[PDB]
Amino acid sequence: RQMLIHRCDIYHEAAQAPSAGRFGIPADRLQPVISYPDTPDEQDVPCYFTEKTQQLIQEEPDQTVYHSFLVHFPLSADIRVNDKIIWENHKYILKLPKRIRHHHWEVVAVRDESL
Predict the structure, then answer these.
(1) 96: which DSSP letter?
(2) Residue 104 CB: number of other CB atoms within 10 A?
(3) Which of 2, 36, 81, 105 could form a disulfide with 11, with the two C-beta atoms 3.0–4.6 Å apart?
């Protein structure tokens, strides 16, 4: 089947500097504040999709977007679950576990705002 190459930016979840919250109770080391950085950790990374799924997110007028897809990445790429990938201005989160097949990292990406 045809395999068009797409380009996305990837952001890894990261532990944020301890910051006492609510009455400034001391932060727990075993429970850091997890979030993404301002800028991409990886940029313009090559990939291609399969098992693409679409969904209607609006009516009158209708609106259809990709809900999820199995992303295929080069093995040299740093892929982590809960990664946020930006493809054509939309956010996606890597959900299910990733794995190696055909010398590629395979992992499911899911529409951010549907989480």
Answers:
(1) S
(2) 18
(3) 36
